[PDB]
Amino acid sequence: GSHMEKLHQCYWKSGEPQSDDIEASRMKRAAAKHLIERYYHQLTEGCGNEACTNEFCASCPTFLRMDNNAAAIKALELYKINAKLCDPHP
């Protein structure tokens, strides 16, 4: 299924007759705080993927990565733009 069908918002102060998609958006964007945490973890550790093909990750096979401090800048920078978060899967 859809982990996130489409991301968009106007304001969080939606004290008006808004759509059903509002409660659906706020639950899936509630993960966006931990998205930053998964990003910072990905930019320092990486992912267990050989076919990663993404510089926005420490385990980038032919590509570059950023230092722990530079990863702190890059983590929330990748969260807002919704970059490729592989994340190390079990």
Q: Report d(CA 79, CA 1) in Å as an integer.
A: 21
The residue type found at 9 is Q
Does the footprint of Zn ion cover residue 52 (CB under 5 A)? yes
Rounded to a whole number of angstroms, the minimum distance from the CB of residue 23 to Zn ion is 32
From 2-10, 39-47, 65-73, 75-83, give the range in contact with Zn ion by CB under 5 A. 39-47
Q: For residue 29, report the phi and psi dihedrals to the nearest 5 degrees.
A: -85, -15
Residues 57-86 that bind Zn ion (CB under 5 A): 57, 59, 86
Q: Report d(CA 73, CA 44) in Å as an integer.
A: 12
Site residues, Zn ion (CB under 5 A): 47, 52, 57, 59, 86
